[PDB]
UniProtKB/Swiss-Prot annotation, chain A:
It is found in: Cell membrane; Cell junction, Hemidesmosome. Palmitoylated by DHHC3 at several cysteines of the membrane-proximal region, enhancing stability and cell surface expression. Palmitoylation also promotes secondary association with tertaspanins. This is Integrin beta-4. Integrin alpha-6/beta-4 is predominantly expressed by epithelia. Isoform beta-4D is also expressed in colon and placenta. Isoform beta-4E is also expressed in epidermis, lung, duodenum, heart, spleen and stomach. The VWFA domain (or beta I domain) contains three cation-binding sites: the ligand-associated metal ion-binding site (LIMBS or SyMBS), the metal ion-dependent adhesion site (MIDAS), and the adjacent MIDAS site (ADMIDAS). This domain is also part of the ligand-binding site. The chain holds residues 1127 to 1330 of 1822 of the full protein. Heterodimer of an alpha and a beta subunit. Beta-4 associates with alpha-6. Interacts (via cytoplasmic region) with COL17A1 (via cytoplasmic region). Interacts (via cytoplasmic region) with DST isoform 3 (via N-terminus). Isoform beta-4a interacts (via cytoplasmic domain) with DST (via N-terminus). Interacts with RAC1. ITGA6:ITGB4 is found in a ternary complex with NRG1 and ERBB3. ITGA6:ITGB4 is found in a ternary complex with IGF1 and IGF1R. ITGA6:ITGB4 interacts with IGF2. Interacts with TMEM268; this interaction prevents ITGB4 degradation. It comes from Homo sapiens (Human). Integrin alpha-6/beta-4 is a receptor for laminin. Plays a critical structural role in the hemidesmosome of epithelial cells. Is required for the regulation of keratinocyte polarity and motility. ITGA6:ITGB4 binds to NRG1 (via EGF domain) and this binding is essential for NRG1-ERBB signaling. ITGA6:ITGB4 binds to IGF1 and this binding is essential for IGF1 signaling. ITGA6:ITGB4 binds to IGF2 and this binding is essential for IGF2 signaling. It is linked to Epidermolysis bullosa, junctional 5A, intermediate: A form of epidermolysis bullosa, a genodermatosis characterized by recurrent blistering, fragility of the skin and mucosal epithelia, and erosions caused by minor mechanical trauma. JEB5A is an autosomal recessive, intermediate form in which blistering lesions occur between the epidermis and the dermis at the lamina lucida level of the basement membrane zone.
Swiss-Prot record, chain B:
Residues 10-113, 126-231 form the Calponin-homology (CH) domain. Homodimer or homotetramer. Interacts (via actin-binding domain) with SYNE3. Interacts (via calponin-homology (CH) 1 domain) with VIM (via rod region). Interacts (via N-terminus) with DST isoform 2 (via N-terminus). Interacts with FER. Interacts with TOR1A. Interacts with ANK3. Identified in complexes that contain VIM, EZR, AHNAK, BFSP1, BFSP2, ANK2, PLEC, PRX and spectrin. Interacts with COL17A1. This is Plectin. Belongs to the plakin or cytolinker family. It is found in: Cytoplasm, Cytoskeleton; Cell junction, Hemidesmosome; Cell projection, Podosome. It is linked to Epidermolysis bullosa simplex 5C, with pyloric atresia: A form of epidermolysis bullosa, a genodermatosis characterized by recurrent blistering, fragility of the skin and mucosal epithelia, and erosions caused by minor mechanical trauma. EBS5C is an autosomal recessive disorder characterized by severe skin blistering at birth and congenital pyloric atresia. Death usually occurs in infancy. Epidermolysis bullosa simplex 5B, with muscular dystrophy: A form of epidermolysis bullosa, a genodermatosis characterized by recurrent blistering, fragility of the skin and mucosal epithelia, and erosions caused by minor mechanical trauma. EBS5B is an autosomal recessive disorder characterized by progressive muscular dystrophy associated with generalized skin blistering. Residues 7-231 are annotated as: Actin-binding. The chain holds residues 176 to 400 of 4684 of the full protein. Interlinks intermediate filaments with microtubules and microfilaments and anchors intermediate filaments to desmosomes or hemidesmosomes. Could also bind muscle proteins such as actin to membrane complexes in muscle. May be involved not only in the filaments network, but also in the regulation of their dynamics. Structural component of muscle. Isoform 9 plays a major role in the maintenance of myofiber integrity. Phosphorylated by CDK1; regulates dissociation from intermediate filaments during mitosis. Widely expressed with highest levels in muscle, heart, placenta and spinal cord. The N-terminus interacts with actin, the C-terminus with vimentin, desmin, GFAP, cytokeratins, lamin B; whereas both the N- and the C-terminus can bind integrin beta-4.
Length: 200, 231
Protein backbone atom coordinates (compact mmCIF):
# COMPACT_ATOMS: atom_id res chain seq x y z
CA UNK A 1 0.00 0.00 0.00
CA UNK A 2 1.06 3.54 -0.79
CA UNK A 3 0.44 6.53 1.44
CA UNK A 4 -3.06 8.00 1.77
CA UNK A 5 -3.07 11.15 -0.38
CA UNK A 6 -4.69 14.58 -0.09
CA UNK A 7 -4.72 14.80 3.75
CA UNK A 8 -7.47 17.22 4.74
CA UNK A 9 -8.46 18.54 8.17
CA UNK A 10 -10.91 21.14 9.45
CA UNK A 11 -12.24 22.17 12.85
CA UNK A 12 -15.67 20.73 13.64
CA UNK A 13 -17.54 22.19 16.60
CA UNK A 14 -16.38 21.80 20.19
CA UNK A 15 -12.99 20.24 20.92
CA UNK A 16 -12.93 18.11 17.75
CA UNK A 17 -11.42 17.99 14.26
CA UNK A 18 -12.73 16.31 11.10
CA UNK A 19 -9.86 14.59 9.32
CA UNK A 20 -10.14 12.84 5.95
CA UNK A 21 -7.95 11.71 3.08
CA UNK A 22 -7.83 9.97 -0.28
CA UNK A 23 -7.49 6.15 0.00
CA UNK A 24 -4.33 4.64 -1.54
CA UNK A 25 -4.63 2.48 -4.63
CA UNK A 26 -5.80 -1.01 -3.73
CA UNK A 27 -8.14 -2.30 -1.03
CA UNK A 28 -6.93 -1.13 2.42
CA UNK A 29 -8.51 -2.81 5.45
CA UNK A 30 -8.28 0.45 7.37
CA UNK A 31 -6.18 3.42 8.46
CA UNK A 32 -4.19 4.56 11.48
CA UNK A 33 -4.27 8.23 12.40
CA UNK A 34 -1.42 9.70 14.42
CA UNK A 35 -2.22 13.13 15.89
CA UNK A 36 -0.58 15.40 18.45
CA UNK A 37 -0.30 18.99 19.59
CA UNK A 38 1.97 21.10 17.38
CA UNK A 39 5.22 21.55 19.31
CA UNK A 40 5.01 18.20 21.08
CA UNK A 41 7.06 15.20 19.97
CA UNK A 42 5.52 12.44 17.85
CA UNK A 43 6.03 10.63 21.17
CA UNK A 44 3.14 12.37 22.92
CA UNK A 45 1.07 11.39 19.89
CA UNK A 46 -2.27 9.66 20.03
CA UNK A 47 -3.25 6.80 17.73
CA UNK A 48 -6.72 6.33 16.25
CA UNK A 49 -8.01 3.44 14.15
CA UNK A 50 -10.48 3.81 11.27
CA UNK A 51 -12.07 1.49 8.72
CA UNK A 52 -13.08 4.44 6.54
CA UNK A 53 -11.05 7.26 4.87
CA UNK A 54 -12.00 9.77 7.56
CA UNK A 55 -11.94 10.21 11.33
CA UNK A 56 -13.19 12.48 14.09
CA UNK A 57 -10.52 13.62 16.53
CA UNK A 58 -12.42 14.30 19.78
CA UNK A 59 -11.53 15.38 23.32
CA UNK A 60 -9.11 18.03 22.13
CA UNK A 61 -8.06 21.30 23.76
CA UNK A 62 -9.91 24.43 22.56
CA UNK A 63 -8.09 26.94 20.32
CA UNK A 64 -5.18 24.57 19.90
CA UNK A 65 -2.98 23.72 16.90
CA UNK A 66 -2.81 20.02 16.06
CA UNK A 67 -0.58 18.06 13.69
CA UNK A 68 -1.75 14.81 12.12
CA UNK A 69 -0.87 12.20 9.53
CA UNK A 70 -2.46 8.93 8.50
CA UNK A 71 -1.29 5.62 7.12
CA UNK A 72 -3.15 2.70 5.55
CA UNK A 73 -2.83 -0.99 6.44
CA UNK A 74 -4.01 -4.26 4.95
CA UNK A 75 -2.97 -7.67 3.65
CA UNK A 76 0.73 -6.75 3.50
CA UNK A 77 0.91 -4.74 6.72
CA UNK A 78 1.23 -0.97 7.16
CA UNK A 79 2.12 1.46 4.39
CA UNK A 80 3.89 4.84 4.52
CA UNK A 81 2.32 7.78 6.31
CA UNK A 82 0.69 10.66 4.48
CA UNK A 83 2.22 14.11 4.53
CA UNK A 84 1.56 16.19 7.67
CA UNK A 85 -1.56 18.33 7.96
CA UNK A 86 -2.03 21.05 10.60
CA UNK A 87 -5.33 22.29 11.98
CA UNK A 88 -6.56 24.46 14.86
CA UNK A 89 -9.64 23.72 16.98
CA UNK A 90 -12.46 26.19 17.55
CA UNK A 91 -12.54 28.34 20.66
CA UNK A 92 -14.39 28.00 23.95
CA UNK A 93 -15.42 30.74 26.35
CA UNK A 94 -12.63 31.48 28.86
CA UNK A 95 -12.46 30.42 32.51
CA UNK A 96 -12.79 32.87 35.41
CA UNK A 97 -10.25 35.70 35.49
CA UNK A 98 -7.70 35.35 38.30
CA UNK A 99 -8.62 36.28 41.86
CA UNK A 100 -9.20 40.02 42.30
CA UNK A 101 -6.55 42.19 43.92
CA UNK A 102 -7.29 45.58 45.46
CA UNK A 103 -4.94 48.53 46.00
CA UNK A 104 -6.70 50.88 48.40
CA UNK A 105 -5.87 54.43 47.29
CA UNK A 106 -8.32 56.05 49.71
CA UNK A 107 -11.68 55.56 51.46
CA UNK A 108 -13.34 56.32 48.11
CA UNK A 109 -10.76 55.10 45.58
CA UNK A 110 -9.33 51.69 44.71
CA UNK A 111 -7.21 50.01 42.07
CA UNK A 112 -8.75 46.73 41.03
CA UNK A 113 -6.56 44.23 39.17
CA UNK A 114 -6.95 40.64 38.01
CA UNK A 115 -4.93 37.98 36.22
CA UNK A 116 -5.81 36.46 32.84
CA UNK A 117 -8.04 33.35 32.97
CA UNK A 118 -6.04 30.19 33.64
CA UNK A 119 -7.69 28.70 30.56
CA UNK A 120 -8.28 31.32 27.87
CA UNK A 121 -9.53 28.69 25.41
CA UNK A 122 -8.94 31.28 22.72
CA UNK A 123 -7.78 34.83 22.12
CA UNK A 124 -9.18 37.07 24.85
CA UNK A 125 -10.46 40.35 23.40
CA UNK A 126 -12.19 42.11 26.30
CA UNK A 127 -12.94 42.13 30.04
CA UNK A 128 -16.08 43.35 31.74
CA UNK A 129 -16.01 44.75 35.25
CA UNK A 130 -19.19 45.13 37.27
CA UNK A 131 -19.35 46.77 40.69
CA UNK A 132 -22.13 47.99 42.97
CA UNK A 133 -23.39 48.52 46.53
CA UNK A 134 -24.30 45.45 48.57
CA UNK A 135 -25.99 45.25 51.99
CA UNK A 136 -25.26 43.29 55.14
CA UNK A 137 -26.04 39.89 53.62
CA UNK A 138 -23.75 40.76 50.71
CA UNK A 139 -26.35 40.97 47.94
CA UNK A 140 -26.59 43.95 45.54
CA UNK A 141 -29.18 46.57 46.49
CA UNK A 142 -29.24 48.23 43.09
CA UNK A 143 -28.00 48.18 39.49
CA UNK A 144 -24.35 47.32 39.05
CA UNK A 145 -22.14 49.70 37.10
CA UNK A 146 -20.74 47.92 34.06
CA UNK A 147 -17.36 48.68 32.52
CA UNK A 148 -16.03 47.35 29.25
CA UNK A 149 -12.30 47.00 28.92
CA UNK A 150 -11.68 46.76 25.17
CA UNK A 151 -7.94 46.23 25.63
CA UNK A 152 -7.41 42.70 27.01
CA UNK A 153 -3.81 43.53 27.95
CA UNK A 154 -5.10 46.03 30.50
CA UNK A 155 -6.01 44.01 33.60
CA UNK A 156 -6.11 46.92 36.01
CA UNK A 157 -8.91 49.41 36.69
CA UNK A 158 -8.93 52.61 38.75
CA UNK A 159 -12.35 53.05 40.34
CA UNK A 160 -12.90 56.28 42.25
CA UNK A 161 -15.83 58.09 43.88
CA UNK A 162 -16.99 55.08 45.93
CA UNK A 163 -18.92 55.52 49.18
CA UNK A 164 -17.09 55.52 52.51
CA UNK A 165 -17.48 52.45 54.72
CA UNK A 166 -19.77 50.92 52.10
CA UNK A 167 -19.40 47.30 50.90
CA UNK A 168 -19.06 46.86 47.14
CA UNK A 169 -19.22 43.68 45.10
CA UNK A 170 -16.85 43.43 42.14
CA UNK A 171 -16.88 40.98 39.24
CA UNK A 172 -14.56 40.54 36.29
CA UNK A 173 -15.25 38.29 33.32
CA UNK A 174 -13.36 37.66 30.08
CA UNK A 175 -14.50 37.45 26.46
CA UNK A 176 -12.98 35.73 23.45
CA UNK A 177 -14.11 34.51 20.04
CA UNK A 178 -16.63 32.13 21.61
CA UNK A 179 -18.18 34.76 23.89
CA UNK A 180 -18.11 35.49 27.62
CA UNK A 181 -16.83 33.25 30.40
CA UNK A 182 -17.86 32.98 34.08
CA UNK A 183 -17.27 35.78 36.61
CA UNK A 184 -14.65 36.18 39.34
CA UNK A 185 -16.16 37.82 42.42
CA UNK A 186 -15.04 39.74 45.54
CA UNK A 187 -16.81 41.81 48.19
CA UNK A 188 -14.68 44.65 49.53
CA UNK A 189 -15.19 47.45 52.02
CA UNK A 190 -12.42 50.08 51.78
CA UNK A 191 -13.04 51.53 55.24
CA UNK A 192 -12.59 48.07 56.76
CA UNK A 193 -9.04 47.45 55.57
CA UNK A 194 -1.33 51.31 52.53
CA UNK A 195 -0.01 50.42 49.05
CA UNK A 196 -0.03 46.64 49.51
CA UNK A 197 -2.77 44.75 47.64
CA UNK A 198 -5.67 43.10 49.46
CA UNK A 199 -7.21 39.84 48.25
CA UNK A 200 -10.53 38.46 49.60
CA UNK B 1 -16.87 56.66 38.28
CA UNK B 2 -13.75 55.20 36.67
CA UNK B 3 -10.57 56.74 35.31
CA UNK B 4 -7.30 55.72 33.68
CA UNK B 5 -4.81 53.69 35.71
CA UNK B 6 -2.56 56.07 37.60
CA UNK B 7 0.29 57.58 35.60
CA UNK B 8 2.56 56.48 38.44
CA UNK B 9 1.82 52.81 37.66
CA UNK B 10 2.68 53.44 34.04
CA UNK B 11 6.03 54.89 35.11
CA UNK B 12 6.70 52.22 37.71
CA UNK B 13 6.12 49.59 35.04
CA UNK B 14 8.57 51.27 32.72
CA UNK B 15 11.17 51.76 35.44
CA UNK B 16 10.93 48.14 36.58
CA UNK B 17 11.19 46.99 32.98
CA UNK B 18 14.31 48.99 32.18
CA UNK B 19 15.83 47.68 35.41
CA UNK B 20 15.00 44.04 34.64
CA UNK B 21 16.47 44.39 31.13
CA UNK B 22 19.64 45.95 32.54
CA UNK B 23 20.31 42.58 34.16
CA UNK B 24 18.73 40.18 31.65
CA UNK B 25 20.91 41.35 28.76
CA UNK B 26 23.85 39.98 30.76
CA UNK B 27 22.25 36.63 29.98
CA UNK B 28 21.27 37.64 26.43
CA UNK B 29 17.59 38.00 27.39
CA UNK B 30 15.08 40.81 27.04
CA UNK B 31 11.49 41.40 28.10
CA UNK B 32 9.10 43.67 26.23
CA UNK B 33 5.95 43.68 28.37
CA UNK B 34 6.46 43.27 32.11
CA UNK B 35 2.91 42.01 32.50
CA UNK B 36 3.48 39.14 30.02
CA UNK B 37 7.13 38.27 29.64
CA UNK B 38 7.50 36.98 33.19
CA UNK B 39 4.51 34.61 33.20
CA UNK B 40 6.38 31.54 31.96
CA UNK B 41 8.93 31.85 34.77
CA UNK B 42 12.01 31.47 32.57
CA UNK B 43 12.90 35.16 32.75
CA UNK B 44 12.38 35.38 36.51
CA UNK B 45 14.72 32.47 36.92
CA UNK B 46 17.32 34.02 34.62
CA UNK B 47 16.99 37.36 36.38
CA UNK B 48 17.70 35.68 39.72
CA UNK B 49 20.60 33.74 38.25
CA UNK B 50 22.17 37.01 37.11
CA UNK B 51 21.47 38.84 40.35
CA UNK B 52 22.78 36.25 42.79
CA UNK B 53 25.20 34.47 40.48
CA UNK B 54 23.53 31.24 41.64
CA UNK B 55 22.34 28.41 39.39
CA UNK B 56 18.63 27.50 39.42
CA UNK B 57 16.65 24.47 38.13
CA UNK B 58 14.15 24.85 35.27
CA UNK B 59 11.07 22.76 34.51
CA UNK B 60 11.21 22.83 30.72
CA UNK B 61 7.61 22.38 29.60
CA UNK B 62 5.02 24.03 27.36
CA UNK B 63 1.75 24.02 29.29
CA UNK B 64 0.43 25.79 32.37
CA UNK B 65 1.42 23.04 34.82
CA UNK B 66 5.02 23.80 33.81
CA UNK B 67 4.66 27.57 33.95
CA UNK B 68 3.47 27.26 37.55
CA UNK B 69 6.35 24.91 38.28
CA UNK B 70 8.92 27.39 36.88
CA UNK B 71 7.46 30.37 38.70
CA UNK B 72 7.40 28.36 41.94
CA UNK B 73 11.11 27.77 41.48
CA UNK B 74 11.69 31.51 41.42
CA UNK B 75 9.42 32.16 44.39
CA UNK B 76 10.98 29.37 46.42
CA UNK B 77 14.47 30.68 45.74
CA UNK B 78 13.43 34.02 47.22
CA UNK B 79 11.60 32.48 50.17
CA UNK B 80 14.61 30.36 51.10
CA UNK B 81 16.75 33.51 50.86
CA UNK B 82 14.45 34.76 53.64
CA UNK B 83 12.63 37.10 51.24
CA UNK B 84 9.06 37.53 52.45
CA UNK B 85 6.62 37.19 49.56
CA UNK B 86 3.28 37.83 51.19
CA UNK B 87 -0.05 37.35 49.43
CA UNK B 88 1.66 36.25 46.21
CA UNK B 89 1.05 32.84 44.62
CA UNK B 90 2.79 31.30 41.61
CA UNK B 91 -0.42 31.33 39.54
CA UNK B 92 -0.66 35.07 40.18
CA UNK B 93 2.58 35.59 38.27
CA UNK B 94 1.96 32.86 35.68
CA UNK B 95 -1.48 34.23 34.89
CA UNK B 96 -0.16 37.80 34.90
CA UNK B 97 -1.83 39.80 37.66
CA UNK B 98 -0.13 43.16 36.93
CA UNK B 99 -0.12 44.64 40.44
CA UNK B 100 1.14 41.46 42.07
CA UNK B 101 3.74 41.20 39.30
CA UNK B 102 4.88 44.72 39.97
CA UNK B 103 5.10 43.78 43.65
CA UNK B 104 7.23 40.72 42.97
CA UNK B 105 9.71 42.80 40.99
CA UNK B 106 9.77 45.49 43.63
CA UNK B 107 10.56 42.84 46.23
CA UNK B 108 13.40 41.57 44.04
CA UNK B 109 14.78 45.08 43.62
CA UNK B 110 14.60 45.76 47.36
CA UNK B 111 16.42 42.60 48.28
CA UNK B 112 19.23 42.75 45.69
CA UNK B 113 19.75 46.43 44.99
CA UNK B 114 18.25 48.64 47.69
CA UNK B 115 18.94 46.68 50.85
CA UNK B 116 22.76 46.60 50.70
CA UNK B 117 23.04 50.35 51.40
CA UNK B 118 25.74 51.51 53.84
CA UNK B 119 25.79 54.93 55.47
CA UNK B 120 28.07 56.33 58.17
CA UNK B 121 26.29 56.56 61.47
CA UNK B 122 23.37 54.30 60.62
CA UNK B 123 21.27 51.85 62.63
CA UNK B 124 20.08 48.31 61.94
CA UNK B 125 16.60 49.54 62.89
CA UNK B 126 16.77 51.84 59.87
CA UNK B 127 15.10 50.42 56.76
CA UNK B 128 17.04 50.17 53.50
CA UNK B 129 14.89 53.10 52.39
CA UNK B 130 15.77 55.23 55.44
CA UNK B 131 19.45 54.56 54.79
CA UNK B 132 19.12 55.61 51.14
CA UNK B 133 17.43 58.84 52.19
CA UNK B 134 20.15 59.49 54.75
CA UNK B 135 22.73 58.86 52.06
CA UNK B 136 21.02 61.28 49.66
CA UNK B 137 20.89 63.92 52.36
CA UNK B 138 24.58 63.43 53.18
CA UNK B 139 25.50 63.75 49.50
CA UNK B 140 23.68 67.04 48.93
CA UNK B 141 24.75 68.51 52.27
CA UNK B 142 26.30 71.93 51.86
CA UNK B 143 24.80 72.59 48.42
CA UNK B 144 22.93 75.89 48.77
CA UNK B 145 19.14 75.58 48.90
CA UNK B 146 19.27 71.86 48.28
CA UNK B 147 17.25 69.65 50.56
CA UNK B 148 16.10 66.04 50.46
CA UNK B 149 12.97 65.29 52.46
CA UNK B 150 11.45 62.44 50.47
CA UNK B 151 11.81 60.19 47.45
CA UNK B 152 9.07 61.98 45.53
CA UNK B 153 8.61 65.76 45.30
CA UNK B 154 12.19 66.42 46.48
CA UNK B 155 13.52 65.11 43.17
CA UNK B 156 11.13 66.91 40.84
CA UNK B 157 13.43 69.72 39.68
CA UNK B 158 16.45 67.52 38.95
CA UNK B 159 18.73 69.51 41.19
CA UNK B 160 19.41 66.73 43.74
CA UNK B 161 20.36 64.37 40.90
CA UNK B 162 22.92 66.83 39.59
CA UNK B 163 24.36 67.62 43.02
CA UNK B 164 24.78 63.94 43.81
CA UNK B 165 26.75 63.37 40.64
CA UNK B 166 28.69 66.56 41.34
CA UNK B 167 29.80 65.45 44.79
CA UNK B 168 31.23 62.33 43.18
CA UNK B 169 32.83 64.00 40.14
CA UNK B 170 32.76 67.82 40.17
CA UNK B 171 34.08 67.93 36.61
CA UNK B 172 30.90 66.43 35.17
CA UNK B 173 28.47 69.06 36.45
CA UNK B 174 28.26 72.84 36.27
CA UNK B 175 26.12 73.47 39.39
CA UNK B 176 26.01 77.17 38.62
CA UNK B 177 23.99 76.41 35.48
CA UNK B 178 21.94 73.74 37.29
CA UNK B 179 20.60 76.57 39.46
CA UNK B 180 19.45 78.40 36.35
CA UNK B 181 17.99 75.53 34.29
CA UNK B 182 14.47 74.16 33.98
CA UNK B 183 13.38 71.01 35.79
CA UNK B 184 13.47 69.06 32.51
CA UNK B 185 16.84 70.39 31.33
CA UNK B 186 18.35 69.43 34.70
CA UNK B 187 16.72 66.00 34.82
CA UNK B 188 17.88 65.19 31.30
CA UNK B 189 21.39 66.48 31.99
CA UNK B 190 21.68 64.34 35.13
CA UNK B 191 20.35 61.13 33.55
CA UNK B 192 22.53 61.69 30.48
CA UNK B 193 25.74 62.30 32.45
CA UNK B 194 25.14 59.43 34.86
CA UNK B 195 24.64 57.13 31.86
CA UNK B 196 27.60 58.09 29.69
CA UNK B 197 30.04 58.84 32.53
CA UNK B 198 28.95 56.50 35.34
CA UNK B 199 27.30 53.66 33.41
CA UNK B 200 24.00 54.24 35.18
CA UNK B 201 21.11 52.91 33.08
CA UNK B 202 18.45 55.53 32.29
CA UNK B 203 15.50 54.10 34.20
CA UNK B 204 13.58 57.38 34.28
CA UNK B 205 12.48 59.82 31.58
CA UNK B 206 12.61 63.50 32.56
CA UNK B 207 8.90 64.06 31.75
CA UNK B 208 8.05 61.25 34.18
CA UNK B 209 9.86 62.90 37.07
CA UNK B 210 8.89 66.53 36.49
CA UNK B 211 5.49 66.16 38.15
CA UNK B 212 3.97 67.17 41.49
CA UNK B 213 4.18 63.60 42.87
CA UNK B 214 6.70 61.25 41.19
CA UNK B 215 6.54 57.47 41.64
CA UNK B 216 8.49 56.84 44.87
CA UNK B 217 9.64 53.30 44.02
CA UNK B 218 10.92 54.47 40.64
CA UNK B 219 12.91 57.31 42.20
CA UNK B 220 14.26 54.92 44.85
CA UNK B 221 15.38 52.39 42.28
CA UNK B 222 17.22 55.05 40.33
CA UNK B 223 18.79 56.81 43.34
CA UNK B 224 19.90 53.41 44.59
CA UNK B 225 21.60 52.75 41.28
CA UNK B 226 23.47 56.05 41.66
CA UNK B 227 24.72 54.83 45.01
CA UNK B 228 25.77 51.56 43.31
CA UNK B 229 27.84 53.56 40.81
CA UNK B 230 29.73 55.12 43.75
CA UNK B 231 32.30 53.90 46.32
Amino acid sequence: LGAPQNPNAKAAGSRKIHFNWLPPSGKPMGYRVKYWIQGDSESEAHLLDSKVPSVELTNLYPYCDYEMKVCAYGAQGEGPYSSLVSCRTHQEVPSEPGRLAFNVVSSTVTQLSWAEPAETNGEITAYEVCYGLVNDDNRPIGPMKKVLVDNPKNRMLLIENLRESQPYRYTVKARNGAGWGPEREAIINLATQMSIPIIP
Amino acid sequence: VIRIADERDRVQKKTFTKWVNKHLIKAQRHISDLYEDLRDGHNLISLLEVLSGDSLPREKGRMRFHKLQNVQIALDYLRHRQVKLVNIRNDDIADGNPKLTLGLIWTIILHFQISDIQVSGQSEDMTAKEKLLLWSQRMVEGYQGLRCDNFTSSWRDGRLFNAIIHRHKPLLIDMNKVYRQTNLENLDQAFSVAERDLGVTRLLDPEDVDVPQPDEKSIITYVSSLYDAMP
